Design a protein around this ligand. Structure first.
Ligand SMILES: CCCCCCCC/C=C/CCCCCCCC(=O)OC[C@H](O)CO
Ligand SMILES: CCCCCCCC/C=C\CCCCCCCC(=O)OC[C@H](O)CO
Ligand SMILES: CCCCCCCC/C=C\CCCCCCCC(=O)OC[C@H](O)CO
Ligand SMILES: CCCCCCCC/C=C\CCCCCCCC(=O)OC[C@H](O)CO
Ligand SMILES: *C\C=C(C)/C=C/C=C(C)/C=C/C1=C(C)CCCC1(C)C
Length: 231
């Protein structure tokens, strides 16, 4: 599996997601607060899922060849199986933090599923020009998600416990910056215009994935906002 130059970044991402999973797992031992237990369960599952998908890419299972532009292009499809389950869980962490209504949550998860789903179709589309149609629809779904997090949650977090509002605003800022980089990497990477080579693209996604899953988890699980206000 070492014939692919990007293997070094897949192995490092695999290791980092594995160590993050174990850290959150041990850290969650003994926590009895029901509210904190919810956040630990959601947040520990995120790197655990990504660990299995990074391992599958390292071993070569999560890779396929897609013909477009007159060439057989290597497409790591396992990323979308990862994101299909981890991006909803990350949104749920934010929504539960601000106690969002059930209707708003369904809208976020539904739009998230469309965003990843259309991204997958664009990744496997064989007509080159059609790949960017799916990219545009996926990006429009992400912009809807970002809009809700700003003009829907922020207005309700400010009316909550101060520790909750401060942690949400930090995680919301982190989320907006990191998530917005994904469509850009896709567009200029091997899946899109092919300006950046695959080995560099893999490096970019690895830094983003670890930050958005482990880094995001470190900020949340160290806050007092996940525990109920008790004496
Ligand atoms: C916090 C501690 C960790 C901090 C570390 C964060 C590093 C992330 C930086 C990445 C971009 C890497 C850019 C490397 C560019 C090499 C490209 C190259 O030389 O070939 C390109 C090819 O010719 C086509 O133009
Ligand atoms: C080298 C290590 C590689 C990386 C590790 C391999 C990951 C795959 C294995 C196991 C799933 C274990 C459980 C995952 C679910 C975590 C949920 C949790 O622990 O939540 C605690 C909550 O407080 C309770 O009520
Ligand atoms: C709260 C919700 C929790 C959700 C927990 C779910 C986590 C499942 C994780 C991983 C395995 C992913 C395996 C995906 C199966 C792909 C197999 C396939 O279709 O391969 C086709 C063909 O054989 C080859 O290209
Ligand atoms: C809308 C309400 C919520 C506001 C939230 C603010 C965050 C906005 C950020 C990003 C969208 C992603 C933009 C990605 C489009 C990049 C395409 C591009 O410009 O590429 C040019 C050229 O092809 C290469 O040199
Ligand atoms: C696991 C970490 C996070 C933050 C994953 C986020 C992924 C996305 C925001 C992906 C977006 C895409 C779009 C909108 C357009 C191209 C296809 C993608 C699925 C990469």
């Amino acid at each position: 599996a070492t014939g692919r130059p990007e293997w070094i970044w897949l192995a490092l991402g695999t290791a980092l997601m594995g160590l993050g999973t174990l850290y959150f797992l041990v850290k969650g031992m003994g926590v009895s607060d029901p509210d904190a237990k919810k956040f630990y369960a959601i947040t520990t599952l995120v790197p655990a899922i990504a660990f299995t998908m990074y391992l599958s890419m390292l071993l070569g299972y999560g890779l396929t060849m897609v013909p477009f532009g007159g060439e057989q292009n290597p497409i790591y499809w396992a990323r979308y199986a990862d994101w299909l389950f981890t991006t909803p869980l990350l949104l749920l962490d934010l929504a539960l933090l601000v106690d969002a209504d059930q209707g708003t949550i369904l809208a976020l998860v539904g739009a998230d599923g469309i965003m990843i789903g259309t991204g997958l179709v664009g990744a496997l589309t064989k007509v080159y020009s059609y790949r960017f149609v799916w990219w545009a629809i996926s990006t429009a779904a992400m912009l809807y998600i970002l809009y809700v997090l700003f003009f829907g949650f922020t207005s309700k977090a400010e009316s909550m416990r101060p520790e909750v509002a401060s942690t949400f605003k930090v995680l919301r800022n982190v989320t907006v910056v990191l998530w917005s980089a994904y469509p850009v990497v896709w567009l200029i990477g091997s899946e899109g215009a092919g300006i950046v080579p695959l080995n560099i693209e893999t490096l970019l996604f690895m830094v983003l994935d670890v930050s958005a899953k482990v880094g995001f988890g470190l900020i949340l699980l160290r806050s007092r906002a996940i525990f109920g206000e008790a004496e």
